[PDB]
Design an enzyme around this catalytic site. Sequence first.
Site, PDB file in Angstrom:
ATOM      1  N   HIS B  61       0.894  -1.195   0.031  1.00 36.68           N
ATOM      2  CA  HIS B  61       0.020   0.152   0.053  1.00 36.68           C
ATOM      3  C   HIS B  61       1.022   1.273  -0.140  1.00 36.68           C
ATOM      4  CE1 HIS B  61      -0.207   0.095   4.678  1.00 36.68           C
ATOM      5  NE2 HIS B  61      -0.295   1.169   4.480  1.00 36.68           N
ATOM      6  N   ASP B 199       0.887  -7.677   2.350  1.00 39.34           N
ATOM      7  CA  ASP B 199       1.104  -6.311   2.226  1.00 39.34           C
ATOM      8  C   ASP B 199       2.614  -6.070   2.371  1.00 39.34           C
ATOM      9  OD1 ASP B 199       0.493  -3.658   1.581  1.00 39.34           O
ATOM     10  OD2 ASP B 199      -1.169  -3.361   3.244  1.00 39.34           O
ATOM     11  N   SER B 632       3.298   2.505   8.764  1.00 36.69           N
ATOM     12  CA  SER B 632       3.179   1.493   7.679  1.00 36.69           C
ATOM     13  C   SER B 632       4.477   1.136   7.044  1.00 36.69           C
ATOM     14  CB  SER B 632       2.098   1.634   6.673  1.00 36.69           C
ATOM     15  OG  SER B 632       0.966   1.153   6.927  1.00 36.69           O
TER      16      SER B 632
HETATM   17  N1  LIG Z   1      -5.476   0.340   7.070  1.00 33.01           N
HETATM   18  C1  LIG Z   1      -4.042   0.439   6.558  1.00 33.01           C
HETATM   19  C2  LIG Z   1      -4.023   0.750   4.981  1.00 33.01           C
HETATM   20  C3  LIG Z   1      -4.633  -0.228   4.047  1.00 33.01           C
HETATM   21  C4  LIG Z   1      -4.848   0.083   2.925  1.00 33.01           C
HETATM   22  C5  LIG Z   1      -5.671  -0.894   1.919  1.00 33.01           C
HETATM   23  C6  LIG Z   1      -4.797  -2.172   1.791  1.00 33.01           C
HETATM   24  C7  LIG Z   1      -4.368  -2.736   3.274  1.00 33.01           C
HETATM   25  C8  LIG Z   1      -3.594  -1.642   4.096  1.00 33.01           C
HETATM   26  C9  LIG Z   1      -3.423   1.527   7.151  1.00 33.01           C
HETATM   27  O1  LIG Z   1      -3.995   2.928   7.240  1.00 33.01           O
HETATM   28  N2  LIG Z   1      -2.112   1.381   7.736  1.00 33.01           N
HETATM   29  C10 LIG Z   1      -1.498   2.785   8.356  1.00 33.01           C
HETATM   30  C11 LIG Z   1      -0.908   2.122   9.868  1.00 33.01           C
HETATM   31  C12 LIG Z   1      -1.745   1.955  10.987  1.00 33.01           C
HETATM   32  C13 LIG Z   1      -1.615   0.783  11.918  1.00 33.01           C
HETATM   33  C14 LIG Z   1      -2.315   0.906  12.864  1.00 33.01           C
HETATM   34  C15 LIG Z   1      -3.154   1.682  13.528  1.00 33.01           C
HETATM   35  O2  LIG Z   1      -4.102   1.467  14.433  1.00 33.01           O
HETATM   36  C16 LIG Z   1      -3.224   2.843  12.623  1.00 33.01           C
HETATM   37  C17 LIG Z   1      -2.654   2.900  11.356  1.00 33.01           C
HETATM   38  C18 LIG Z   1      -0.550   3.524   7.584  1.00 33.01           C
HETATM   39  O3  LIG Z   1      -0.878   3.352   6.334  1.00 33.01           O
HETATM   40  O4  LIG Z   1       0.398   3.867   7.959  1.00 33.01           O
END
Ligand SMILES: N[C@@H](CC1CCCCC1)C(=O)N[C@@H](Cc1ccc(O)cc1)C(=O)O
Lengths: 697, 696
Positions: B61, B199, B632
Amino acid sequence: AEGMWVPQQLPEIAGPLQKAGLKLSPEQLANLTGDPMGAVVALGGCTASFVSPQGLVVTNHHCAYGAIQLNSTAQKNLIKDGFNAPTLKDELSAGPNARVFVLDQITDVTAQAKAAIAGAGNDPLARSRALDAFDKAQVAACEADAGFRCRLYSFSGGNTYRLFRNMEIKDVRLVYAPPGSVGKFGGDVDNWMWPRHTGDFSFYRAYVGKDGKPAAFAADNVPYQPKHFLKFADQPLGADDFVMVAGYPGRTNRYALAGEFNETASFTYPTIAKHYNAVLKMIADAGKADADVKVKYAATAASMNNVAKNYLGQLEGFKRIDAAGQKQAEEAAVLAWLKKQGAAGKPALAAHAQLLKHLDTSKSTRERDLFVGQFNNTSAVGAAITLYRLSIERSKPDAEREAGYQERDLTTIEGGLKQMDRRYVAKMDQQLQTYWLDQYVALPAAQRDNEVLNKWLAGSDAAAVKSLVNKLGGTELGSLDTRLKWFKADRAAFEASNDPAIQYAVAVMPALLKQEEQKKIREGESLTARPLYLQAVADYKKSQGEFVYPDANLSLRITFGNVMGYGKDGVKYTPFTTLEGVAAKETGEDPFDSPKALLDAVKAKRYGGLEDKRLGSVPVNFLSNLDITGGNSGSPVLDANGKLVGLAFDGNWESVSSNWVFDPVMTRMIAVDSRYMQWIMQEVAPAPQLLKELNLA
Amino acid sequence: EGMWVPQQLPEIAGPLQKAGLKLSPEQLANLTGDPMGAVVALGGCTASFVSPQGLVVTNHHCAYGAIQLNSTAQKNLIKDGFNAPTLKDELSAGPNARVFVLDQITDVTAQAKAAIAGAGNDPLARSRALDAFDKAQVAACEADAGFRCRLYSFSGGNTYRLFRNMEIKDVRLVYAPPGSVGKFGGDVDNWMWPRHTGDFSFYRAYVGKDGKPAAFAADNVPYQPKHFLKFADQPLGADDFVMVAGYPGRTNRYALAGEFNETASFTYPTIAKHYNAVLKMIADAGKADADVKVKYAATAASMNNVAKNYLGQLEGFKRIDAAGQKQAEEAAVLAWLKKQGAAGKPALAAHAQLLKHLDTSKSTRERDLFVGQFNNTSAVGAAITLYRLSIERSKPDAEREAGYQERDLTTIEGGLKQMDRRYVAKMDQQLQTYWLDQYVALPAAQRDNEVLNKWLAGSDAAAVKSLVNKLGGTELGSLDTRLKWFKADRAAFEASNDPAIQYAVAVMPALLKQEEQKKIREGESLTARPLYLQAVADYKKSQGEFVYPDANLSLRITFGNVMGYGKDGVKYTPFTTLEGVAAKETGEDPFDSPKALLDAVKAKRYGGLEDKRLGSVPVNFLSNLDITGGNSGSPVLDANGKLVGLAFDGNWESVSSNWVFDPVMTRMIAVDSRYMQWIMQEVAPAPQLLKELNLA
Ligand SMILES: N[C@@H](CC1CCCCC1)C(=O)N[C@@H](Cc1ccc(O)cc1)C(=O)O
Ligand SMILES: N[C@@H](CC1CCCCC1)C(=O)N[C@@H](Cc1ccc(O)cc1)C(=O)O
């Protein structure tokens, strides 16, 4: 345990029962009018049971929804508010068609039945007539005595026939319903789901006349005094503990053809679910414009939601386990085993042939038939049909009337005309008529060949519909007084009336009688063919070891197993929920708007003496690996000593598909714990008079 | 549980050993040594170097922009894999793609405080005094050619640190799994457990032949990292100690109670409603024109993530009574201060000052959102940015608005190139229409953007339609036109008959005073905010609570253990497995795994990667770490510093922890290194990378 076992199968599940943890002897269960089986009762398409010597009866909230709805108004809404009767004289009539059936007796009539079917020889219609006349005659002799109603059951496709005799209690009254936020917590979101936190229970009371016989409602009626009734359990129910259910499961289709399954999976479930979700959108929308509509159509809505969601869950259930494959394999596996047998297996192969040929009839006509069927089952048009049918059936002597329309059935028809005064609003019926008409005119021209309906429409536009609904709008059948007169009236008054609904009922009734006749010929054909194949399928199953029990047919059945959870990649569902799970899901908005008194009690850890030290809290719902389906709602769950520890009300998301193909890994019953029932009544929606009746004060 | 700055390693030394860390604590205080020197910043994601020839590993991502830039409808790399077997095959990840490698961190608190006190009393002067100090430190730190530097405010401005970074400017895409692996479960499984998502993706960092950072040239050679991470040999199991180091963006745990109350009641529900409206518009235009689907893929995904995240936090707020906990801590602090005597009067004045900032922002909040969103549509946003830049060019470099200086030019020019692969006139016009339909629906009292009502000439639907037609006649859709205005000066913009340019010229004086006003408030908060957060931290320490600054885009360290979490009726287990991915199969997006995966799993080809404690190979796992946006791609290291997976998401009940941390149910979701390896072996292979990594 897989299995919806009939009581006549108690010999062979005796060992399995004891091994699972039963501490009664199975002989005590074999007495179906003794302690505890004789307290299990049927309502119709629900189970219930006696729990007091003064005729008090417990079942699910969603089973009582009908009665609760009947007695609700928009100002005084008992679905929302719950209800409690502190004294006998406060209790509300559940309505004219409320029933409690108490089992008197079961007798096998297999040899007789088969002799009657053989006496008709070749001809299908005759084979169906002969079985019908056998049913009527057995029912007449059984119901000679007042206050009994009898029913004949076909088992295993026609291999076995048994006659049930019940005492039919006709005066049933509501005693207690918790608020809708407890009885229906989580609404349509949590339906068919675990984890679950729903207080799905309610209480009735059975009355009889001063003389002791069942009577319709009357102010001088008195409580019925049952032989036997269940007691609430004093032993705390924990994980792995033995449990069993007795009840009246409706229908299962586990021995169906791969073809039957395939037509159901790819036409019926998606089509019905789609249209239901449209009609529901329309009712919700009308219901916000006028709250009388919301209340009069709330039983329809609740029931349609349940069906539509169930169908979406079965479709997905079928991908999870590839039921198209398993059906195909087992079906081809059997056709092979038969090929092997020493010429004795050839008659069952011929039977398979006949059964296949039944399925192909409808491909082009099946949207049409639904749409027409549904339009004919809207309120005013459906009343008009019922009424006109009866007037024809009244021509004939009683023994030759259609089941549904004999003397013994008049009470019930009349009760339905009455009940519809609480479930009918002209401006809503007109929207329903419009909806299904709109779906008929949207069909391809070739598929729109209902000639009566084409004549009444005079076209296929939206204006044709509008104009026909306006014309059907001049019916008088939305008046009770009118309905009750038509209930008495002669066939000739119908044929000479200018009431538009009646005129239509008269125009359609020949096609309806012809469709009815073809159906009877099909039943007639399969009455030697289904039993032949189903015996082969069963002998093949017994070949591979394995369990054989009949598909459910609205008769009494036993299931047993243990309290236990289930698992999925990354997840283990624990067997209990508790009070904190209820609070935790609070949104302050439907369907998660618990009463304040509940939220208070949970905040203060006011467990009222009901906590399980192994859980830390009072349990709410629980999981077990028992085999239930529709009709098992409200069934009592018994521990190893036959005391009541919960009511069955639902299953989990994965279980819904097991109407067709059972899955031991992920099929689970959801029940409401007897401790949550008592808790709610002590701490939230109090029923002190009732806690004393059940000896819990 | 905390997002610990490196300077806090003393305190957490005990807890770290207690938790299961084998390395010493001061191995880790070495920020350019082992294994911390392997960890890199990508802008707003994390990554790590994993090979001596500049290989970098991050989330699919995070790489999604690069992949999308490199995709067309005919050749969609998002849906399909990408593999580069030799160096010459590796695609440029785009002009604006970066890797930051940490050089140095020095504390410059006292200089910073001196600098603002130096301006005395005027708020706007305090704003400028610190803008001036920031630039000075940056320009001196950035004086050597390779390097990029940033000033960080910590704890409301009680601390200031300067970060020095080697800036790699030629980043190339090596490997992406197919989208049905790297984004398995799409928006249904997003923010959810149990999870089954592959991912990850690989970049390669390049420098010129001098060893110095240079933009894309085919002459450039892989960077050679000093330090990189090795994959774990030790199999990760439940209870094992895990830690993450990364660049978390923002947390609001130290927000005022009214800040929270307004985010919860207004911001999150409003943004969630409007983003969902727009997502449906985009999905529908996407089904029509496959060109639109591809060019707007990064927008949709980003908007979906935000939208579902906001829905999640609101449910968290009700599940923990966020509102009541914030109120209780505010009341308790306010009262702990009321009888500190003189040690507490300054902090109380500051609270009062902050509450006014909030009252002013309420009056304008609905317009600010719709006008902001309008002014960030592609064509209009460009016109504003380009015109602003020519205004700024007039001034000498030190006197230019941050983001508009010499150092920022390369970025600005990159944005205009990247927009080429991310723009379609007819979709931009639907987005312009949408935000304008929301402005004209506002009650007349609140429609007080002078310039915009003038350009609207009405407030019905067909005055919107007339304005969007008028903006249709712009040439800012063409790359070479944008690039021309990137060069031109004030006088040409003021001479242009391009509709968007006239629009930008017209709005610029309003925007500039609205920005002057912002800096007066920023000036007021520069003494208030640190005072009040010092009070909260003072009180919190007396109660013996964990004390650590809100995330601020700087490098942070978090630790804990592999474990699930429970809910009423449910006990979630720490790992998922290969069979879990096969069971979620539909054959329709987004549960349409590649045939190769279904086959490998159906026939149990575990490529020697099975962990026995599970019947098969791990896919994702859970642990009680403290992460948020920017974490991430962050490497997850075992107790001995080796790599066991990438951080990529949180569970549903975690997202609320932005504002109020719940330890019982806050978990990180990571992809296990064994699933990564498994994918490059048995599904969309990359043998060349298995060689580069010593897994073959
Ligand atoms: N939900 C993920 C992004 C998704 C995008 C579609 C494919 C699968 C992953 C996301 O927003 N990750 C954050 C990191 C994060 C981790 C844990 C918590 O509580 C909040 C944020 C990022 O992109 O940095
Ligand atoms: N899902 C229930 C209906 C109610 C659930 C509580 C909320 C309101 C609606 C239902 O249909 N129950 C069946 C019983 C049943 C249990 C388990 C399985 O697999 C199938 C059916 C019934 O009413 O008979």
